[PDB]
């Protein structure tokens, strides 16, 4: 199931804002920043909180819950900036909202990069 396993996929594909699971990313993809889709770059810290939502996987035709945790405590990665907004909603639906820094409750809130963690089927 390569479509569910970014580490087995082509890097150019996962590093693209159009990669299916990045459908509500506002930020720099961690996979372009010395990390991977599910690992923070060295010396940056996962956020315990995140915005969430669902993305369609066109490879297997199913919808998946994605959790958009940030990596924190280093200054902006600067690479692979995305601003995708599928099913994103404003702050009165706070955990669907991506115009806030999901590093906000980390020991250091400086935003480094963001990613898309697969939680499960929607």
């Amino acid at each position: 199931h390569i479509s569910l396993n970014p580490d087995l996929a082509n890097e150019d594909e996962v590093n693209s804002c159009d990669y299916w699971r990045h459908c509500a990313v506002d930020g720099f993809l961690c996979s372009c920043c010395g990390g991977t889709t599910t690992t923070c770059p060295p010396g940056s810290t996962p956020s315990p909180i995140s915005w969430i939502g669902t993305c369609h996987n066109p490879h297997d035709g199913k919808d998946y819950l994605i959790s958009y945790h940030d990596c924190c405590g280093k200054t902006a990665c600067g690479r692979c900036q995305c601003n995708t907004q599928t099913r994103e909603r404003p702050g009165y639906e706070f955990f669907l909202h991506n115009d806030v820094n999901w590093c906000m409750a980390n020991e250091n809130s400086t935003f480094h990069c963001t990613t898309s963690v697969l939680v499960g089927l929607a």
Binding site: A76, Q81, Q85, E88, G91, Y92, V100, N101, S109, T110
Partner: protein, 360 residues
């Protein structure tokens, strides 16, 4: 010759605008750039550290910023603050300590506001639990934390009351907070449901009149909140769209995406065609000019890829902003007229504001 400091901004307050540059690529060095809208001249700037927010005091005398520091930037103790700066000298005057939960996020107007009388700053917190924080400007103190606003978002001041504001809640209604002269909650009320959160979510940016506010939705509907009385009365939807518009799937998009010209009732909205799920922050293909009394469009002009706007009532001006460039329009007549574009006003700005001239 001798180099001197201590100088004031070289243009009158009435010429000044404030472009909040997030500098997202280097977000620890955000700043406010001050420009003269009449000629595009750069007048000065205020440094605002990590993800600064900004507003100018209603009396025009001071600039307020909100930001986060750490002892060693990426490590060490956090300090969330409001800073008071002199508007003419662009100098720091005082720091007001906040609890370490001020909103870190893009520069929507409604995250950092003030009461109509200018005596209280009203700001959004997220820990991620939400509440509204109240700063007493004169005392230089954080004086109230409005936990009644949990699950709500953003601050819409009521221009017809001295210390009242509203917030948009997860029930699709509005919570109104009336502060006492001490900045503590004096009373509150909750409206009936205005919009369906699930079926017709609104953009948070108000098109704000003296006694009412309008909101546009993801699907191009308009909702209104009338606060001429103590209880807010809500209504809507009416559609921005006629049948032709619907055929090409026109919808709103942007950030600070609407404005109201109070003398005429004209509402300005950034719109783009081929709307679908995920296009709510797309740059403007057009600006539409709506008559809020007749509930019909009166004009449409090119949008210049703008994302955010602001209105000056007394000079009949609209600014628009595409992230980097500021367009200046005369809106004294129903069709806006483009006067000039200030190129390179910011690297990554979603908010521009005029210096207030209307006093308190």
């Amino acid at each position: 010759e001798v180099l001197t400091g201590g100088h004031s901004v070289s243009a009158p307050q009435e010429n000044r605008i404030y472009v909040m540059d997030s500098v997202f690529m280097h977000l620890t060095e955000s700043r406010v750039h001050v420009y003269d809208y009449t000629n595009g001249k750069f007048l000065g700037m205020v440094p605002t550290a990590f993800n600064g927010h900004v507003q100018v005091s209603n009396d025009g005398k001071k600039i307020y910023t909100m930001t986060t520091y750490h002892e060693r930037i990426t490590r060490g103790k956090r300090s969330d603050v409001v800073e008071v700066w002199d508007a003419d000298k662009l100098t720091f005057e005082k720091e007001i300590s906040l609890p370490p939960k001020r909103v870190q996020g893009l520069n929507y107007d409604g995250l950092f506001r003030q009461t109509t009388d200018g005596k209280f700053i009203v700001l959004q917190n997220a820990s991620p639990a939400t509440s509204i924080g109240i700063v007493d400007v004169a005392k230089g103190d954080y004086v109230e934390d409005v936990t009644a606003a949990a699950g709500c978002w953003s601050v819409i001041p009521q221009p017809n009351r001295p210390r009242s504001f509203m917030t948009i809640c997860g029930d699709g209604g509005l919570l109104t907070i009336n502060l006492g002269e001490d900045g503590k909650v004096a009373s509150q009320s909750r409206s009936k449901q205005m919009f369906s959160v699930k079926d017709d979510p609104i953009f948070i940016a108000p098109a704000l009149d003296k006694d009412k506010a309008h909101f546009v939705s993801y699907y191009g509907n308009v909702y209104s909140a009338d606060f001429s009385g103590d209880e807010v009365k809500v209504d809507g939807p009416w559609s921005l769209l006629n049948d032709e518009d619907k055929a090409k799937n026109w919808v709103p998009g942007g950030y600070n995406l609407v404005g109201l010209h109070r003398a005429s009732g004209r509402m300005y909205v950034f719109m783009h065609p081929d709307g679908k799920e995920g296009t709510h922050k797309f740059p403007a293909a057009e600006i539409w000019v709506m008559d809020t009394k007749t509930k019909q469009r009166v004009a449409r002009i090119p949008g210049r890829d703008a994302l955010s706007m602001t209105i000056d009532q007394q000079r009949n001006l609209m600014l628009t902003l595409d992230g980097g460039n500021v367009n200046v329009y005369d809106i004294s007549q129903p069709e806006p007229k483009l006067l000039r574009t200030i190129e390179g006003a910011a690297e990554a700005s979603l908010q521009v504001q005029f210096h207030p001239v209307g006093g308190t």
